[PDB]
Write a protein that binds this DNA or RNA. Structure first.
Length: 596
RNA sequence: UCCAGGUGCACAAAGAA
DNA sequence: TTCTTTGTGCACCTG
């Protein structure tokens, strides 16, 4: 009932000096060359695929096509996403079983199982360990993307941050027998570092922490201004402001690290007893005053504010700045708009001098990350009307809000989707459901909110553009699912794939249509379900044309038997936007190749 | 690499309308 | 028949 093989380097294991008696002695030559590869320091940067050629004897594979079939899996490992898997059958299907020395005298019925075991041994004892020996995987948190840095380069970066974290008394070694709550992880950031704790799995005390966080969040919501959702705040502010809107988004640098613990402790003590009792108040003060982490098998005390990665840090930091915001945001003039999501501030006002004061005001209290400041103030260097905030883009001139997409140049779009669930496993003989399951609404439901489809401040042009951009992501996930499945799947099951494609367009168009009518505003003029279908089809056309050759049969049924014209009553629209891939998605990379 | 919040969608059992 | 509670899981988003 096990169909998947995880590509994660965490699922590897150590290799013994000799090979288990279960397997063949041909893994001895693989093991011996593995240690010899580890003993020579690198005279130059290495290529994993080109270097595995010397640890694995061609003897194990025989013909070149067997060797190339195995290393296709290795290439997937070298360029993996988080939680990515492959079908286990890939390791033992379509091999030339009679063309290898070590399965010549063996029964034909059993050896497909034998090759599967031996391939697993190489992947788990040789392939993954040699990758981990040379590179450290870093998750960029832009989807499931993983980047591999030289571990030699990472250790040097880690040591420089570690010594600086000690020079400044942010990290102090303790001689006391405390036990650390987790391991300290130094995460590389552009021209910066982020120090986090990888909390140890503590399931026995998890419900207690959920109780503590819930108590804090109610203290927050009943004594602190819950003005409303960002949606209500923006719609109300835009409707009451006629003139040009000025605004700024500014990023606090290290909000958690600049929380002064003694101030936070006495905020916690000041909480009324009926909202939080004494034994829980003392626990939280003790918890945040003694933050111990393990680093290079030594124990250290984190001495700079709240420690990121701890379960309580998120709500306690939010509690700290809700108190700080409240004295300043209660002086807010009637004309202003203010919203804060953790460590990002969004402030708008018809008076530019009010906005300009806010920027310096925050810069005077907190340290600011200036590379992320976005504003339309003419006083600044590089003003712009479009401001990203909380996953959306706000246009201060047109008041239009639009979805934001973290798609850097050369980003592999497949990193944004999780196709493989190790907990529900799907047979390799059933690519039908694998594709159907991948067409699940939640992966894009954050682009289907009241922000994207309203007509109270958003024009019909923006609603269509939001829907089109969302359907581009759906089409890219469809392409990623096709590439994960076998090459034959497309033309044998073309009829099934078409029905899945057609059903997907209805469901997303119907979901968008229902969301639009519920949030009708003064600008809703006429959107028809057919027009939504046309936009969704064109989104698939723009994406499928990146591989016209493979998807031509699909592209032709779309043109031949689907209406691609778009009847929208709105006249200030631009139909050209729905004719090609948008600027964001045009430059995403769609081909997988090993770079290390 | 970790954590808290959210947006949802599915599911089933039970106990009512 | 249909709805409404309690769960469960799972895939995305925000910092």
């Amino acid at each position: 009932m096990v169909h998947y093989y995880r590509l994660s380097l965490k699922s590897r294991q150590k290799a013994p000096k000799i090979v288990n008696s279960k397997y063949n002695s041909i893994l001895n030559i693989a093991l011996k060359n593995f240690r010899l590869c580890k003993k020579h320091k690198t005279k130059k940067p290495v290529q994993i695929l080109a270097l595995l050629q010397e640890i694995i004897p061609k003897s194990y594979f025989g013909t070149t096509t067997n060797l190339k079939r195995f290393y296709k899996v290795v290439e997937k490992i070298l360029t993996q996403s988080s939680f990515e898997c492959i079908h286990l059958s890939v390791l033992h299907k379509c091999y030339d079983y009679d063309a290898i020395p070590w399965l010549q005298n063996v029964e034909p019925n059993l050896r497909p199982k034998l090759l599967l075991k031996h391939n697993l041994f190489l992947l788990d004892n040789i392939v993954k360990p040699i990758i981990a020996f040379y590179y450290k995987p870093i998750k960029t948190l832009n989807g499931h993307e993983i980047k591999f840095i030289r571990k030699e380069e990472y250790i040097s970066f880690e040591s420089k941050v570690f010594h600086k974290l000690k020079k400044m008394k942010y990290l102090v070694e303790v001689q006391d027998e405390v036990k650390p709550r987790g391991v300290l992880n130094i995460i590389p950031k552009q021209d910066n570092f982020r120090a986090i704790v990888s909390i140890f799995p503590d399931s026995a005390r998890k419900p207690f922490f959920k109780l503590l966080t819930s108590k804090i969040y109610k203290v927050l919501e009943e004594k602190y201004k819950t003005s409303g959702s960002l949606y209500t705040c923006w719609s109300e502010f835009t409707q009451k402001t006629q003139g040009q809107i000025y605004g700024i988004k500014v990023d606090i640098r290290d909000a958690y690290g600049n929380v002064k613990i003694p101030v936070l402790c006495k905020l916690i003590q000041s909480i009324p007893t009926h909202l939080l009792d004494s034994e829980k108040k003392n626990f939280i003060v003790d918890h945040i005053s003694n933050q111990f982490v393990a680093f290079r098998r030594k124990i250290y005390k984190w001495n700079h504010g709240l420690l990121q990665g701890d379960p309580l840090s998120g709500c306690l930091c939010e509690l700290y700045m809700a108190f700080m915001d409240r004295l300043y945001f209660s002086n807010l003039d009637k004309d202003a708009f203010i919203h804060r999501t953790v460590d990002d501030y969004f402030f708008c006002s018809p008076h530019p001098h009010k906005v300009y004061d806010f920027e310096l005001l925050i810069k005077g209290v907190y340290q600011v990350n200036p590379t992320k400041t976005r504003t339309n103030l003419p006083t600044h260097r590089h003003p712009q009307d479009e401001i990203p905030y909380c996953g959306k883009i706000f246009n201060l001139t047109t008041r239009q809000v639009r979805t934001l997409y973290k798609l850097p140049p050369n980003y592999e779009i497949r990193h944004k989707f999780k196709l493989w669930n190790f907990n529900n496993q799907i047979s390799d003989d059933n690519p039908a459901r694998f594709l159907q399951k991948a067409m699940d609404f939640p992966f894009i439901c954050n682009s289907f909110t009241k922000f994207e489809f309203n007509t109270v401040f958003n024009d019909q042009r923006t609603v269509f553009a939001n829907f089109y951009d969302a359907m581009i992501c759906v089409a890219y996930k469809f392409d990623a699912a096709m590439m994960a499945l076998r090459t034959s799947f497309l033309v044998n099951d073309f009829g099934f794939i078409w029905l899945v494609l057609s059903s997907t367009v209805r469901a997303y168009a119907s979901r968008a249509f229902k969301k639009i009518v519920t949030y009708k505003g003064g600008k809703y003029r006429k959107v028809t379900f057919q027009c939504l279908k046309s936009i969704a089809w064109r989104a698939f056309l723009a994406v499928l044309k990146r591989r016209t050759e493979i998807y031509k049969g699909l592209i032709d049924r779309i043109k031949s038997r689907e209406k691609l014209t778009m009847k929208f009553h709105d006249g200030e629209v631009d139909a050209s936007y729905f004719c090609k891939l948008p600027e964001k998605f045009r430059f995403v990379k769609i081909n997988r190749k090993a770079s290390i």
